[PDB]
Design a protein around this nucleic acid. Structure first.
Length: 187
RNA sequence: CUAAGAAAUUCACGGCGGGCUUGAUGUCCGCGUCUACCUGGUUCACUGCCGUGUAGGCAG
């Protein structure tokens, strides 16, 4: 994708930057739900995989008309005191490419119990002996804490940046901006 | 290279029997506890779907 926009979280005493990036990713998801499309990607160029931090930057990649459209929408109403804007410009050359993947886990055993007892009509003990409590997977990935609107549930979403490649291939994106085959330029 | 260097305590057993502790009592006067605070630190690791699959993803 040719054009990128960098929005920086303004340093704020009233909330930590994790909460601002949470609400920014959430309103980003709501704006991408309102526009649709699968050619709109995200990246976080302030990565730090030692302490698993997401930093303070948000880089959204698409075309020119999409970015200049997303500037003038009410998904930036009520937030523009708390973040700074950049300019939609071309990605420089040359840059590597990588992905943004959502990596969940089956770290809750109880959902797997409910699944195995709802499809098979087992008992609690058969589901307990089939899958033990050691199935919980630990993760060292950065995460964003979003809530739900209609049936409200607050969850952390882990973001994984993939390996740096030399060329990018075609592919879509979700409403979260996450990679489904399409890679974002890393710089 | 140590006041070094060494070592088998052990067999057996009936502590019990008896008893009145009692009478009497004023706790009591008095008291300024105050001043000021972000519960969030991502702190709700959730809910459902495709998939035979626990393999892998998805949707909010």
């Amino acid at each position: 994708m040719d054009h990128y926009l960098d929005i920086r979280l303004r340093p704020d005493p009233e909330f930590p930057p994790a909460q601002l990036m949470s609400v920014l990713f959430g309103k980003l998801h709501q704006a991408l739900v309102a526009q649709g499309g699968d050619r709109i990607g995200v990246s976080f160029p302030d990565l730090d995989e030692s302490r698993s931090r997401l930093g303070e930057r948000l880089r959204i990649h698409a075309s020119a008309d999409d970015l200049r459209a997303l500037l003038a929408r009410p998904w930036l109403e009520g937030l523009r005191d708390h973040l700074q804007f950049g300019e939609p410009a071309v990605v420089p050359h040359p840059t590597p490419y990588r992905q943004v993947s959502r990596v969940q886990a089956k770290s809750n055993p109880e959902r797997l119990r409910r699944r195995l007892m709802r499809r098979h009509d087992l008992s609690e003990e058969e589901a307990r002996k089939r899958i033990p409590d050691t199935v919980a997977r630990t993760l060292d990935l950065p995460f964003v804490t979003l809530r739900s609107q209609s049936t409200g549930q607050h969850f952390r979403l882990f973001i994984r940046h993939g390996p740096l490649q030399a060329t990018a291939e075609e592919g879509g994106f979700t409403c979260y901006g996450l990679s489904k085959g399409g890679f974002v330029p890393w710089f």
